[PDB]
Design a protein around this ligand. Structure first.
Ligand SMILES: [Ca+2]
Ligand SMILES: [Ca+2]
Length: 348
């Protein structure tokens, strides 16, 4: 059998032929896989399609409601990225926020063969879901706006991964977003720190994570609001599991575009988009003191600065920009120099 036509009338006709198979021409969630195929969508769009047509409100979706919606989508959305954003977005918002992904991911948990074991343990559903969503925004939401647009989604590999869910029974093969194994490792590291089990960790806890390799001034910036995704205004002195995920991923690889932005935001004390000499010295100050505790005589700030200027080659004298750090391709060295002491554990 040859491929289906792509045009509007043909697609609508195919949808109608599919709904004609349903009692009362209303689709339940169990029918939505067939509906996804009629739409030329990957299987795991079934949840988004159902919720998109308000299925959660009445328990089913009539052909008339679904067709009217899909007509609109085909009029407004030329590609998969546009269609996906349209399905998940809140009315009034031309973008996706973290919470928009929850029903989709819950359906993935409820139905994907690779998560069957997890499905019967709803205790950890939300934490798995939270983890996947963090990894999605970490990779996709390059503007740090908290709002994923069609353009951002289009530039990512996210939808490719969604399409692959139906092809891979072992979800752990899909390492970028959905991997349960990646979630497990991340969660267990959080668990080690959260010793009183209140699902929050403080600065003392966070310092333990890599054996006090990060300076206390940098640890304090993690708690400042500079990188929090939770939009909280007050300095609460504790961070959530969700924010820990962002820290862990950033700390383990300081070379990725998102991670460079993460550490840049922390160093950018006044949040003006440039690292001033005051800001660099503020951090390097503590590095020297820590190095002293290890019988290492640190370079004076101006000597260290010579080497960093040569490493980074910033465009404008007197400041280091995010663009400078990305272009030098050695931002991890820059960051480590200013706030990371790998073998600080061995200090005497
Ligand atoms: Ca705790
Ligand atoms: Ca600044």
């Amino acid at each position: 059998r040859p491929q289906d036509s792509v045009n509007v009338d043909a697609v609508i006709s195919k949808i109608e032929s599919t709904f004609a198979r349903f009692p009362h021409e209303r689709a339940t969630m169990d029918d939505m896989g067939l509906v996804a195929k009629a739409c030329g969508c990957p299987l795991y769009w079934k949840g988004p399609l159902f919720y998109g047509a308000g299925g959660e409100r009445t328990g089913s979706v009539s052909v008339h409601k679904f067709v009217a919606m899909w007509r609109k989508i085909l009029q407004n959305c030329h590609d998969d990225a546009a269609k996906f954003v349209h399905l998940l977005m809140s009315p009034g918002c031309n973008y996706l926020v973290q919470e928009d992904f929850v029903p989709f991911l819950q359906d993935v948990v409820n139905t994907h063969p690779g998560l069957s074991f997890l499905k019967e343990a709803s205790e950890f559903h939300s934490r798995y879901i939270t983890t996947v969503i963090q990894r999605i925004f970490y990779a996709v939401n390059r503007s740090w706006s908290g709002r994923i647009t069609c353009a951002e989604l289009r530039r990512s590999s996210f939808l490719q991964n969604v399409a692959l869910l139906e092809e891979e029974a072992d979800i752990n093969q899909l390492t970028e977003f959905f991997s349960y194994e990646h979630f497990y490792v991340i969660y267990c590291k959080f668990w080690e720190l959260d010793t009183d089990h209140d699902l929050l960790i403080d600065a003392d806890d966070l310092a333990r994570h890599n054996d006090h390799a990060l300076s206390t001034k940098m640890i304090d910036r993690i708690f400042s609001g500079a990188v929090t995704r939770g939009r909280k205004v007050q300095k609460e002195g504790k961070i959530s599991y969700a924010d820990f995920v962002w820290f862990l991923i950033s700390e383990e690889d300081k070379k990725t575009p998102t991670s460079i932005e993460y550490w840049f935001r922390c160093m950018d004390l006044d949040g003006d988009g440039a690292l001033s000499m005051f800001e660099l010295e503020y951090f390097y100050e503590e590095q020297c003191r820590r190095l002293d505790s290890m019988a290492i005589e640190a370079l004076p700030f101006q000597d260290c600065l010579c080497q960093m200027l040569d490493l980074v080659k910033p465009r404008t004298e007197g400041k280091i920009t995010l663009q400078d750090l990305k272009r030098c391709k050695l931002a991890n060295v820059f960051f480590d120099t200013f706030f990371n002491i790998e073998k600080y554990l061995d200090h005497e």
